[PDB]
Symmetry: D2
């Protein structure tokens, strides 16, 4: 019912101008700041967060489906990253300074982004080279972040740093004016996901400390769990959209006297992918039903969805034949190129499988009964 109202709100906010902003963002290969401002103004982040310090997984999942329906990794990932930075601030931001930047972010007045990954420490955030040092009642933050999505338009960056004065990982919020944003990378896909290296050599007040030394990894893991749940939801919705488009093609394209849908090998392949996509969507509902954000569950669902998504898009692109390979005839290549980011961005398959494995429990009694 609060969820039915949230869905009603998403249906009002995700209108024809959002679809138009998405299409233009794809053509320009840049994130439209007006989307976050529009979602903020519409009360999307406000209705999602309400007065809770911890996220409502049901609302998180419904927003992920809305983003996924746009079939644009850049747009969807961009919004979800902003929202995941909000999740870090809501749970870990104690100062009035942080609660105010968090409120600005919920309103869509400030764009937030994550500064975790580096050239050396991409998957391993423990080997972070970015340093945080206490000086003049504030902090000195120095380092380079490799992949900072939304950095060309962000107002604040959630920087993962290693404290010189002290595990040892901390999170510090740094304003955009105090960082050097490099030229955005030319990437394989996800055009509107403006990603660039960020060079930091500045000072920040003590109030800008999001998570103190020895708590930074818990804070970034919380945001990454929030992000992983969203990526899984976005994959489920974008895969459903791709299956539906592919089916429309299959029912109109005729070859060897029959439509493609009448060719049983293609029909049953699609039915298998549909069944598996439906399973992922039902699983997300099932996870939301528990009403808690769990790090291992988020890791598990995101890796499974990223690997399924890759397959769905590859097989949809295959069914479009030659036309699928022609950029001015179909957009399948763009979908396929965007989806390839899923297994790497937001945590690699291996890192996520290590997190799942770490919490797996043996059954000694059952093993005793089998031997």
């Amino acid at each position: 019912s609060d969820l039915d109202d949230f869905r009603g709100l998403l249906a009002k906010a995700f209108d024809e101008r959002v679809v138009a902003w998405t299409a233009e963002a794809e053509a320009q290969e840049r994130f439209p700041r007006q989307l976050i401002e529009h979602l903020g103004v519409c009360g999307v982040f406000d209705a999602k967060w309400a007065t809770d310090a911890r996220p409502d997984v049901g609302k998180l999942v419904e927003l992920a489906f809305a983003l996924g329906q746009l079939a644009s990794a850049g747009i969807g990932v961009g919004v979800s990253l902003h929202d995941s930075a909000i999740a870090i601030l809501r749970r870990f931001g104690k100062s009035d300074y942080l609660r105010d930047i968090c409120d600005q972010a919920i309103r869509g007045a400030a764009v937030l982004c994550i500064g975790a990954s580096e050239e050396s420490g991409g998957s391993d955030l423990q080997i972070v080279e970015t340093e945080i040092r206490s000086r003049d009642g504030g902090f000195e933050v120095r380092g380079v972040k490799k992949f900072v999505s939304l950095s060309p338009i962000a107002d604040h960056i959630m920087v993962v740093a290693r404290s010189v004065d002290h595990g040892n990982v901390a999170v510090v919020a740094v304003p955009a004016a105090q960082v050097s944003v490099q030229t955005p990378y030319r990437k394989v896909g996800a055009g509107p996901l403006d990603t660039a290296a960020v060079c930091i050599d500045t000072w920040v007040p003590a109030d800008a400390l999001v998570a103190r030394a020895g708590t930074g990894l818990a804070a970034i893991s919380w945001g990454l769990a929030h992000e992983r749940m969203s990526i899984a939801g976005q994959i489920a919705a974008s895969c459903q959209r791709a299956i539906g488009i592919t089916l429309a093609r299959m029912m109109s394209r005729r070859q060897f006297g029959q439509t493609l849908f009448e060719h049983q090998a293609l029909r049953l392949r699609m039915a298998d992918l549909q069944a598996r996509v439906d399973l992922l969507r039902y699983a997300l509902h099932g996870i939301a039903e528990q009403g808690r954000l769990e790090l291992r569950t988020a890791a598990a669902v995101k890796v499974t969805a990223a690997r399924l998504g890759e397959e769905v898009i590859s097989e949809c692109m295959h069914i479009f034949g030659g036309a699928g390979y022609l950029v001015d005839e179909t957009t399948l290549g763009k979908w396929w190129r965007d989806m390839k980011l899923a297994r790497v961005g937001g945590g690699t398959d291996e890192v996520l499988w290590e997190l799942v494995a770490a919490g797996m429990t043996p059954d000694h009694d059952g093993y005793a009964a089998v031997v």
Copy 2:
């Protein structure tokens, strides 16, 4: 929730004696009739069905997990088949005779089984050779059914038949007592030992009140029972896979090779983490489906084919991690699990038949297609 009370009831009924009966049933390759009687006497079918004509998918799923935890396809499948035949009677059985047979089945006083498959028409139930003909205010029933699981112990068989009085639709479902059928010698099978399956020869007459579903409603009646069955198979797979993963992890954490435990070998660890993530996804999906609170033919078809294919991979990879020991019948039971799981892609609807059901309800997206071209 009434669901927490149902779980509490399942925890009471699925006791150490049930575990022992399962083990004995495996050794004897015979279904233990006492399990259905026990579940009936315990109020399991009664609490699941209550006064509803249509099933509570949450309770259906919880019972499937309890059955799945036993890691025995014969035991789990046999119970689910009895309960799916109850689902057919609850929704389609109109006569006082059928409602009484149905009540007996809920009590565990009568064992029901399904006689759908034939030598010719296995997957295609429209091409059933078994005939039903109106005679003397009743019905003549003649035919042979090939894969009737529980037939050696059943009291009534839900027979799918083609009406000769009607024009081909034609399909009907008729309840036939055990005494009025000839059950053949049970088949030696690849696995699922306690799932007593045999051919059933029928040449009999039954009263009009034995008609479960009249000509042209028979396929809907059997599809309803099969949807109920498919949801249960998926839950049994999710639970049995979880049990196998847990046992395999215990083996991995004790077995040492090349100076490390198997769990310390990253290639085995990540492989198990991927299987775990996928079995978890299936379990969450079953909860997601149950929350919708309705039994849908296509959803049941889609979850059972997915689970069957996943379950085959999980058991094969768990068996592989047991190495040579996995191949020794008196050292480990992994081979039995693996042989049992191979039935999942065929029994209760083949992958292809279930993918055809899924495909039949798939809808094109014209607006999105207009945007891509």
Copy 3:
């Protein structure tokens, strides 16, 4: 062996300047005509073809590996297409006009391309809309061809056409000069940048001697060229996959994460060992096929679909091991490799069409079946 001398010749022709032309072709997204001229001038096509009407599969395969080593679908595919059109002329071109065009193509004086695919009939070449009609001792040729690779630089197009003088078989192959066709603007494609592909509009007349294959022999002529092409695609995939595995292993042995190099992470190591074993198997299979010394339509179909599907997996998994860097176009070329490889399952015959060819020649085993039942 004449094969060792052919390898020696390939080693001389595939020099640092060829490598540089490849790089420039990638940047410009234009096929370098000079490569075909260079290969012709070097005696590559001449040594491959000698005086044979039918191809030497060993030399075909060796040339495919040389092309594959460049890790560029456009460059490799463009050369192979020119050479496959030579295969059609060598076996089917009877007139002095065709033998001269064929000799020019072996010298690298004339670039040949294939005009088979249409907007309607892409995979099904029996439903070609392009028509051929006898007129004034020659032939009228009218139609549109959709995917003509090399058409912006070709001198002659091998056009698959349907004869209106004959009864539907009907299919013919006719050689049409570049000046007598209208080549459309090349398509922007997902990958294979230097593979200049465009639609070709035809409404012209040609002499009788331009007839490559008369009505009812056209499908055999195009299938012959496609079989030659498919064998080459498989060899190009085997070589390009080996190059990708070698580069990825260098990255794995230098890149450190969680205190170890990537190669020291067992899950990545075994994954690469499995891909290596499978690419090795494909390379050995190509040698095995070449030893048979004959070009077979079904064997070419079976090896190309297998290789295309294997190659997609190899490049996707190599790209994955490059992590974020794999996704950055100015840091690594893995994305280009991956985008190029996606063409393999569609260009030169889709998986489904090739599996239909394989299936058509599959033979049942009656004696074994009698022993199993």
Copy 4:
């Protein structure tokens, strides 16, 4: 031509009585000793080995196809194991005692078998508990071997042992009369592959030493490479046989108005498996063309074939539907149960992938050109 004569010889030796011996062996779940004696008497091992100390891979592969055609893992594996023990003796057996037992084995007068695997050290043969000690000009050999195929009928066992007097691994030939063969195991499949534990507590002459301490692993690896090439050949032939039987079923079984072969999803699935089985067979010809037994190539081809074989048999069994699951209606279950041994017996996937990985070479120059 020597190969054409070898094929001609195989066609004469693999007759109706060999097919009858196979069928009876399956029913009895025991290896028919008369098969090895018959193959010996026919000159099969003699023609294969000639006067060479190193195997002719072409002849090795042709014999593997003959064995594979029988569709019986027990029979085929049994013969190949005998022949692999011959390979160890031919290259490593220096004493007249060993050359004579080797000649007896080629004649089919003596059945040989391998005693490598143990309860603790299955995949890791370096951690072997079986000990070899020099005493009274001979050797004292003490230990237990877990999986010794053909042990109930063998005359000599090639025992992998760790020398107390001394890497440290050795191979020693022990006569059957000097070992305690346990009751054969009840196994998942491969019924006629009589496998049992072997308890050794005996003394042997110095002449019985096949490979001295520090050479035993090279000797067992040579035999295992010979065995792996044969397993790959057997899988290729048995998979071809299964595809052909499955196709006969598909062309006679009618469902939903069409034969199974007319159902495109099943047809294209079979075409894919056929294409892949043909690729494996061509690869074996390609490997034989190099005319050398290579440890890594044998490891690579066997693991690839074992994994393909599992898939082929599982999918053939699926196409037989309910009938496939009925033991008195079809033999698909037996094939499926036999094939499951391929990924474990003769080296596990992981051990074989470690051997392949160990010889993989990086391309530094190409990597320099990509970055």
